[PDB]
Amino acid sequence: GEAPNQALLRILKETEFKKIKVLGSTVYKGLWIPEGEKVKIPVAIKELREATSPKANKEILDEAYVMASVDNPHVCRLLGICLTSTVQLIMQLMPFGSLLDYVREHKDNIGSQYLLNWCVQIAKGMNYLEDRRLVHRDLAARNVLVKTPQHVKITDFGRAKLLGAAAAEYHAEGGKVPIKWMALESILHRIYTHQSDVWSYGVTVWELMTFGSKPYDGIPASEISSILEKGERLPQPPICTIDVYMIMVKCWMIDADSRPKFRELIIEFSKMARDPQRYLVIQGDERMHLPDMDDVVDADEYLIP
Ligand SMILES: */C=C/C(=O)Nc1cc2ccccn2n1
Numbered sequence: 001g002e003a004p005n006q007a008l009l010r011i012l013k014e015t016e017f018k019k020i021k022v023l024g025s026t027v028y029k030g031l032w033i034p035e036g037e038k039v040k041i042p043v044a045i046k047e048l049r050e051a052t053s054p055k056a057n058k059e060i061l062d063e064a065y066v067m068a069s070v071d072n073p074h075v076c077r078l079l080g081i082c083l084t085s086t087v088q089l090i091m092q093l094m095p096f097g098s099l100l101d102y103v104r105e106h107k108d109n110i111g112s113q114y115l116l117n118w119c120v121q122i123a124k125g126m127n128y129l130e131d132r133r134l135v136h137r138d139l140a141a142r143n144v145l146v147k148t149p150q151h152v153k154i155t156d157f158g159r160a161k162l163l164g165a166a167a168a169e170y171h172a173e174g175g176k177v178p179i180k181w182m183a184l185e186s187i188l189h190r191i192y193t194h195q196s197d198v199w200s201y202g203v204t205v206w207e208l209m210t211f212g213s214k215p216y217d218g219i220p221a222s223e224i225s226s227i228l229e230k231g232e233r234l235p236q237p238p239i240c241t242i243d244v245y246m247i248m249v250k251c252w253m254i255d256a257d258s259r260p261k262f263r264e265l266i267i268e269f270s271k272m273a274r275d276p277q278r279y280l281v282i283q284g285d286e287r288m289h290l291p292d293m294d295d296v297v298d299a300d301e302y303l304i305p
Pocket residue numbers: 023024027044076077091092093094095096097098145153154155
C-alpha cells in the first residue's frame with residue numbers, strides 16, 4: 001500500500017526551445033522559453049537518434065518517469081518531455097559536465113573543501129532517493145553532474161528502480177552492468193538495496209579522492225567477484241587520511257546492514273568538511289579556487305506549482 005505519485009509530467013512544444021550546440025553522441029546545450037513566461041532556462045536536451053527502436057522509447061520514458069518524481073537540490077531536475085518523431089528529454093543544463101570529467105580536468109585546482117562538500121552533496125542526494133524508496137543502481141562519478149564547482153547533482157536514472165510495497169531487495173535479469181561499482185550481493189545474486197547504493201557511493205568517493213582513477217584498473221570484470229570474496233578492496237588514496245578511507249571501507253563490508261546509512265555519511269562528511277585539511281592532505285590545498293541573457297533564470301529558480 002503505497003503513496004500515490006502526483007508528480008507532473010510537463011509536455012513541451014518543440015518551438016518552446018532552441019538547440020544552441022551539441023554536447024554528446026545525442027545531447028544538446030539549448031535554451032527553453034516556457035509558453036508566455038518571459039524567462040530563458042539553460043537546458044540539456046537528450047534526443048533519441050534511433051526512435052524506431054520501441055525498446056529504446058520504453059527506456060527513455062522510464063528515465064523521464066523517475067526524474068519527474070524527484071525534487072531535491074542534489075538530484076537532476078527534469079523540466080519536461082517533447083513528443084516529436086524523436087522523443088526529447090529537457091533537463092536543467094549542468095554546464096561543467098560530469099564530476100568524473102571535472103576532477104580529471106582539474107586534478108591540480110581542487111582542494112579538500114570541494115571534495116568533502118561533494119561527498120556531502122551526493123550523500124544528501126542519495127539519502128533523498130532513499131526517503132523516496134528509490135534505488136539508483138548506477139551511482140558513479142560519471143553519473144554526478146556539476147551545476148557549479150560548489151553544487152553537484154546525481155544523474156542517470158536509466159537503471160533506477162523503486163522497491164515494491166514490501167520489496168526490500170530488487171531482482172533484475174541481464175544487460176551491460178557496471179561491475180566495478182556494484183555491491184557483492186548485486187554481482188552474485190542481482191540483489192540491489194539502498195545499502196548496495198552505499199557500496200557504489202564508496203567507489204564514487206574513491207574516484208573523487210584519486211582525481212578520477214579507474215577502479216581496479218586493468219582487472220577483468222570476471223575477476224571482481226572473486227577478489228571481493230577474497231576480501232580485497234580498492235586501495236587508500238594518497239590524499240586520504242585513514243578517517244576518510246575507513247568510511248569508504250565500511251561502505252564495502254559484505255554485511256550490507258554493516259555499511260553506513262546515507263544519513264550517517266552526510267553527518268561524517270559534514271564533520272570532516274568543517275575542518276577539511278585535517279581529513280584530506282593535498283599539495284598547495286591552501287591556494288585553491290574555482291568558479292540576450294537578460295531573462296535567463298537557472299532551472300533551480302524556476303518553480304512550477
Ligand atoms: C542532469 C541533467 C542533465 O543531463 N544535464 C546535463 C547533461 C549534460 C551533458 C554534458 C554537458 C552538460 N550536461 N548537462
